[PDB]
Structure 1
Amino acid sequence: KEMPQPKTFGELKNLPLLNTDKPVQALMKIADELGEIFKFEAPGRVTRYLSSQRLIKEACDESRFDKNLSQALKFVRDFAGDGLATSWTHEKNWKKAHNILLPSFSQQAMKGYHAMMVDIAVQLVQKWERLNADEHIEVPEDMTRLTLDTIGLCGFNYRFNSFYRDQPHPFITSMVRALDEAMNKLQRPDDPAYDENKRQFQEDIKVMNDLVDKIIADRKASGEQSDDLLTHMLNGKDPETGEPLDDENIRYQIITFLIAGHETTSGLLSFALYFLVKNPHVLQKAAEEAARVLVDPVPSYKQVKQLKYVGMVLNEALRLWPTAPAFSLYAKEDTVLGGEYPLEKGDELMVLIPQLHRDKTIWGDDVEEFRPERFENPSAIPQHAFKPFGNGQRACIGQQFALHEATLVLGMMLKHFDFEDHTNYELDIKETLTLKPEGFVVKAKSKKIPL
């Protein structure tokens, strides 16, 4: 009945607890101490963090709870607009864009993106083939190059050419700095010395809008048709309203794909490779499948679907470190959670995904061990125990995209290289709005298999 709550800071309540460079990991430690639910109070803000499958399965009941915009999402909305990830379910543009975009993100639609994904994947493999002896790989840096370029190519047929650069394309620099400002605002009084941050923030917003608006205008003027999401959005019509997306909303969706997809997906690849080099038996099993299945110089769509164990590796990496680590809900009406926590209409909940994925009542006592064999049969996994892609109609629309991209790329990596954890890397998880293993490095020795 009485809800646990972490330490307070006078008038600031719990807010200073988030003034730390690893806030998700701090919240996990608080959940370890306080249990399946704790209250978190700030000036003008109350929320409750959920960690157990017992309570989260109720929070995922869409008749009782709807997606809430967390403070992080509200700040991202300043440049993602009413894109899919930062719009309320009741906003006309959410259901409109959802209906238009769902078929172009289906498993069947990955057949059309496959060639462009292979284009960037081959660039990554060639970069590593061309490294000299005793040079090493900066894993998240290269994974982020790959996912950004892949979303750029599949999203709107634009080549960021990240593998030709040390300093990223100006759009990426402004996007990363915009996301950084959004995160920093969470841990922040509105002192006059933040005026520089604000002026830079508006400059970065303009950089993103200008490039994306320009590409949209260029595409409309040309009339050319590609296999990208931009073509689908220029030609799609919502069956419900009968309307297409307008040019401004299309821009917000493109920005959203880049934000929502690039860092989550590169983090997944980075964590997956981290767990593989730390668990050599798993690596060997995953590399055997890669060599057996990927028998052609270029992987096909059907071959990627056959990489079952690689997919199991990715799910277990998502279990331990889900790279979009939380989502927020509000109670649609007065309701009682778990039979002991009464909630009033509008009350907010946070789903702490890494804690959910460590619920021993679901996964057993070995929750911290990396064992892809947990995912041999996904249907056996209990409902709402595994939520790396969110929930319900507000779940990740790019789930099939992210997993196809990650399975293809990891499969090619395991096919073409042996990996060495040459520094005995100590896991250090850097936190933005997503999670990544900072400073993770490996050496790759080519198996000399041509492309």
Structure 2
Amino acid sequence: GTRTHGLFKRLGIPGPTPLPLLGNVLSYRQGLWKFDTECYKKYGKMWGTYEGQLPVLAITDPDVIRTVLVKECYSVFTNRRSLGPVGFMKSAISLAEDEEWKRIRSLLSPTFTSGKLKEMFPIIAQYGDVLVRNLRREAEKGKPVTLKDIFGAYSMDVITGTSFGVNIDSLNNPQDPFVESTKKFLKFGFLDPLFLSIILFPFLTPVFEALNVSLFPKDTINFLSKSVNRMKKSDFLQLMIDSQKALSDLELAAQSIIFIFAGYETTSSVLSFTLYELATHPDVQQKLQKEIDAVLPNKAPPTYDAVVQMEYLDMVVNETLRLFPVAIRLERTCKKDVEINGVFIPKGSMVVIPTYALHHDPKYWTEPEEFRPERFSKKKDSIDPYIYTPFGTGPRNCIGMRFALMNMKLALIRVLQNFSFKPCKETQIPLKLDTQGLLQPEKPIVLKVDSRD
């Protein structure tokens, strides 16, 4: 297993020497965020690695990133990582490819406009009541609060409510079938010999597909797919039903499932990261509460234009996503041979935009390890959209981005209206990141939560 391991050597592209069969995969064990940053430091603008035999080209030049993510998205860099064994979930928008992706993305676009988001605002804001009640019971407990329990439950509640209109109280119904099924999405493929064998030996994917082996939790997929069909007999779901070029009843089920998959852990982790930064920066937290109280005096309920016009809240969310871009990197496959900034790259190679590394780059951000929301003041020069990519850029960016920001802002408004967050002896400071999957802390974020009354 070395046939491709001379590619970058031959092209002159720097990078860490791969091992036979494994490639550079052993360097993932410290975390992809750490590997990308150390490679950037060591090799510069562009470096090559191998996932088994698969060549991987990382690029950090904003102009080359623009060509990959926008200019040649339809012609060359249309799809992400080559598809693992996923069964009918291949129809999910995030896993679909080429013409099928273009159609599905186009059918779902009316669902994610800013106009539809303004309509669904009351359906989203209503989950703030449960959130505050849950956190109150934990705050009035006089003990540190494990944030991920509170905000994981909120993240699940909102994405499921906006999906199906079912108001589950995740935190208070641990044995609800929706709750237990969805939690299987956490730690997606952690140390699983199946995921690793797929990465090293991508030719095994059609074998596992033929055996009904899926990277997803089968029992979760089946429950959610069957749950979708029974409700159609009797919302994101309602928008897709009305749109029925057709969106088949299996394609529609794939979207319902993938929205929950994409929005659940991401929103939860970012929320918890945000409150860590506010607990460790009281002055930021107090400035934000000052702005919230000036817009919504006497804990007034949030409205749409009030959320959109909170500048410092927007800066705080953006600075949190700079420090903690939970997807770590963007990935595209060369569906044919392509020249990328003078480099001839073979068909099937992967191109990586190392979001985390570029977000912590001292060449673009002064004091890059510091939490400074003022970076995102609209008075300052615009932020290069190819350096700052927590949601990606171009035709294949995060379709739920607007919704995810709105959800997180509504959560942060309601808890900060009622509570203050400070560290305790059990708080890990500095926070250390995990080494697997989406960005999350090595130890669960715990904080002291005090009510403002």
1:26-425 equivalent positions in 2, closer than 5 A: 26-63=35-72, 65-70=76-81, 74-75=83-84, 77-78=86-87, 80-91=89-100, 94-131=101-138, 132-166=140-174, 169-176=179-186, 179-180=189-190, 185-186=195-196, 205-222=217-234, 228-237=235-244, 241=245, 243=246, 245-295=247-297, 296-331=299-334, 334-338=337-341, 340-363=342-365, 365-377=366-378, 380-423=382-425, 424-425=427-428
Query: How far apart are the structure 1 equivalents of 2:296 and 2:129?
Result: 14
* 1:53–1:362 Cα contact (<8 Å) kept: no
Range 108-117 or range 308-317, more displaced: 108-117
- How many Å separate the matches in 2 of 1:144 and 1:179? 19
Q: Tell me, yes or no, if the aligned pair for 1:318 and 1:388 is still in contact at 8 Å.
A: yes
Instruction: Give the number of equivalent residue pairs.
Output: 424
Task: Please tell me whether the aligned partners of residues 67 and 328 of structure 1 are also in contact (alpha carbons under 8 angstroms).
Answer: no
Distance 2:449 2:304 in 1: 25
Query: How far apart are residue 440 of structure 1 and its match?
Result: 0.8
Is 2:451 the partner of 1:446? yes
CA distance in 2, matches of 1:309, 1:447: 20
CA change 1:200–1:284 in 2 (3 A) is farther
Residue of structure 2 equivalent to 1:2:
12
Deviations 1:155-205 (A, max 9, x none): 122344212145672312433365547797238889xxxxxxx99976974
Secondary structure at the residue paired with 1:75?
coil
Cα distance in structure 2, aligned partners of 1:441 and 1:36: 38
SS in 2 for 1:25: helix
Change (3 A) 1:67 1:413: farther
TM-score (norm 2): 0.85
Q: Unaligned regions of 5+ residues in structure 1, if any? A: 191-197, 223-227
- Secondary structure of 1:288's partner? helix
CA distance in structure 2 between the partners assigned to 1:201 and 1:145 by the alignment: 29
Between stretches 379-388 and 389-398, larger displacement belongs to: 379-388
CA distance in 1: counterparts of 2:325 and 2:40, whole angstroms:
16
Cα distance in 1 between the residues matched to 2:213 and 2:339: 41
Superposition deviation, residue 322 in structure 1: 0.6
Once the two structures are overlaid, the 10-residue window that deviates more, 312-321 or 131-140, is 131-140
CA distance in 2, matches of 1:122, 1:65: 47
Q: Which of 417, 426, 432 pairs up with 1:428?
A: 432
| CA deviation map 1:295-329 (0-9, x unaligned) | 35422222211222111111111112111122212
Q: Take 1:408 and 1:352, find their aligned partners in 2: how far apart are those partners? A: 29
Match of 1:14 in 2: 24
The residue identity in structure 2 corresponding to 1:148 is M
Partners of 2:381 and 2:109 lie apart in 1 by: 23
Q: 1:37, 1:50 within 8 Å by CA — same for their partners in 2?
A: yes
With the length of structure 1 as denominator, give the TM-score of the two structures. 0.85
- When residues 167 and 275 of structure 1 are mapped into structure 2, their CA distance, relative to the original with a 3 A threshold, is farther
- Residue 154 (structure 1) shift: 0.2
Q: Is the 8 A contact 1:178 1:205 kept in 2?
A: no
Find the aligned partners of 1:189 and 1:88 in 2 and give their Cα distance: 21
Structure 1 residue 214 displacement after superposition:
2.8
Contact 2:270 2:326 in 1 (8 A): yes
Q: Is the 8 A contact 1:178 1:201 kept in 2?
A: no
CA pair 344-137 structure 1, distance change in 2 beyond 3 A = same
- Going from structure 1 to structure 2, the CA distance change for 1:394 and 1:324 (only over 3 Å counts) comes to same
1:38 is displaced (CA, Å) by 1.6
CA contact (8 A) 2:21 2:53 kept: no
How far the C-alpha of 1:389 sits from its partner, in A, is: 0.9
Describe the superposition over 1:52-110 as per-residue Cα deviations: whole angstroms up to 9, x where unpaired.
43542332243264233325xx338457422111111322xx22322222122112212
**For residue 155 of structure 2, what is the amino acid of its counterpart?**
T
For the aligned residues, what is the CA RMSD?
Answer: 2.9
Q: State percent identity of aligned pairs.
A: 25
Change (3 A) 1:431 1:236: farther
Q: Unmatched 5+ residue regions in structure 2? A: 1-10, 202-209
**Conserved 8 A contact 1:39-1:46:** yes
Report SS of the residue matched to 1:17. Answer: helix
Helix, strand or coil at the partner of 1:176: coil
Query: What letter is aligned with 1:442?
Result: L
